[PDB]
Symmetry: C4
Subunit: 219 residues, 4 copies
């Protein structure tokens, strides 16, 4: 029966049947957004949902026999497994993000369809070359996030009161969003020199960020 | 009579005469902005407008005899047809955007002058090589737009209440405009971890965007 | 006496002397900012200012005899002429910007110190290859600016009431600064569909600017 | 005894020992953020802190005997000396930013681990090649900062009242953060033409920045 199913799994029909379901389950998840729609045809799509969930575990079960060990070494497959596992956790108990994390199965459209995998792979591949920089920034953020918590956190605890808060605020300054009117002109009503902290921070952080892009335009 | 008019239409005078009307109609449209101007010379320029509107259909009528099927397979010609057709719809009924969409005819200065044609063509040509990324993103947006509506839409209906509202708001985050103080800090007053949704959303979307630019700096 | 002064002008001493005054007059202009300073050494500097202005007309007079027609064909030289000229208009009458436009003479440090000429020249040279695009956009701005004035100017005359007001606002959206919370969300309270005008606008305008940058990174 | 210690300092175990203390002291500083932690184990940490500071002085002393002049001509060594020195100034007196500047010792993780050095060095190296542009800009800022102070400082002293105040405000505009709704629309309620100062300012500074990025994207 092995080759019987190895022929079912590898079939164009099977793979296109899966893809057909993703675009259907995606269309159905956009409709579950409408509180109106849910009042009318709610039970339909709650069932239609659970149906697809079964179908998908059946496939992943079928797909595992055909591949065994090879499957739990395939990034795209590992994903598909974990993205379905989330969708099996009872619609209750634990955390309720789990109900919401269910929309992640629509990322199977990236998995099930090539060109997409290509494009995703193309993107992902750029990451190892960046880890040296990324390592650098996180060190850098960490260092300033500490200075900031202990330099500004007493008077301005919303923004800098906690290590985590500083991270967030520094990040915000890094995206350069409302950094002056929002954070530093305020800080300067109390700490006139706060500009001496944040302008150098902005330069260094924006510089590094430019360099990193130039690097991705050389690989 | 064909070759007679084929020599009228294909003439330098013809082409340059059309260009003369565009730069003239365009000037007349900047003046129709002023309520002052309209109180004095409004009659002049409404009629001048209708005149130019005739002339342009006449030309398009002429241009179609000279080209027949060659024309409805010309992108630039198709445009001029549609844009003039808009300008034909009676200054009444339906939607006032049809009155406003009339200004689209000034895009004929792009259509009727090469170099422009080249430049526009240069730009457009870059697009097909972005469609893999663009497709990828819209899936990504759609997934997160869905996540957002069910995570934040009950307490925050202005911003995430409807799928469409999530889209707009997610877009707003992508352009990084007032993303934190405008959206995520508020959100965090009620949902402390919302940074876990938006910091990742930001990284991915800005990453993809950098890559997309790097792609264009190859081709 | 001609070659005598051609030996005065072309001298190393002459140029470095001009340069030395620039750095001095520049330092002196940052000091004229201080209302404190002016209350003490103010006359010292007002006269110092009037002195250097003479020295500069003398130079421009000298440089003209030594170069005659070749001079009024030199960008850098024309500049110092027009810049020094501005600084000759009495400290009175007409407009009061002219007194303020005086500090433009510090741009002579660019004109008079090589390598600066290089860098400026390096920079300026790029503009020709952007002219086709820059043209394209101004047509584009102009068309949308007209559309906006007649679509939003009645309810929102601060932002869109006038052709020029619209220019400014569209410019502001293009730098993507406070475009949503500041302009488009407000607009949507009256015109639900304004997002149909501003999202495509942003895309086009951002796209074009990416292409223009990619273009520069080839030439 | 020299070669005895030269073999200690140059030992892999030594360096790895140093790197160990850095990652350890860095963990300690993250914990010194918690007002909680300090009440519990504050003493443990302030002592562990002074211990590490000792060890590092011992090291730098050792390191200097083994390198002498070679050391004080080494960027990375000079750094480590100057960073450890800051941490030596007693917990008392002068400026208390000195207590805060202590956390700068976590930059030793950049100094002591290569690849980081590589990456930092890669970054730093681009700077000499940017100095022509950087000099040009600062003169530019200086010229406009002076103009701005005398054009807007009377009615708007928060933003332009002082040379330094103008620098900051112009800097804020350059990062394009809230430049319109926050600054120029205000300015225009009093000075209708201020757009004539800031739009040209914005173009130039943004132009220069695109060139500087492209310049790097070759070198
Ligand atoms: Ca912003
Ligand atoms: Ca803002």
């Amino acid at each position: 029966m092995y080759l019987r199913i190895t022929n079912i799994v590898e079939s164009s029909f099977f793979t296109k049947f899966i893809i057909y379901l993703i675009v259907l389950n995606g269309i159905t998840m956009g409709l579950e957004t409408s509180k109106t729609f849910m009042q009318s045809f709610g039970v339909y799509t709650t069932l239609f949902n659970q149906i697809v969930i079964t179908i998908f575990t059946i496939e992943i079960i079928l797909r595992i026999y055909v591949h065994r060990i090879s499957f739990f070494k395939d990034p795209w497959s590992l994903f598909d497994f974990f993205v379905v596992a989330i969708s099996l956790v009872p619609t209750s108990s634990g955390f309720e993000i789990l109900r919401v994390l269910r929309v992640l199965r629509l990322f199977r459209l990236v998995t099930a369809v090539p060109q997409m995998r290509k494009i995703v792979s193309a993107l992902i591949s750029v990451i190892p070359g960046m880890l040296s920089v990324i390592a650098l920034m996180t060190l850098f953020f960490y260092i300033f996030a500490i200075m900031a918590t202990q330099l500004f956190g007493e008077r301005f605890p919303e923004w800098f009161g906690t290590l985590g808060e500083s991270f967030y605020t520094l990040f915000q300054v890094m995206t350069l969003e409302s950094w002056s009117m929002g954070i530093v002109r305020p800080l300067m009503e109390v700490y006139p020199y706060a500009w001496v902290f944040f302008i150098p921070f902005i330069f260094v952080v924006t510089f590094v960020m430019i360099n990193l892009v130039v690097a991705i335009c050389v690989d």
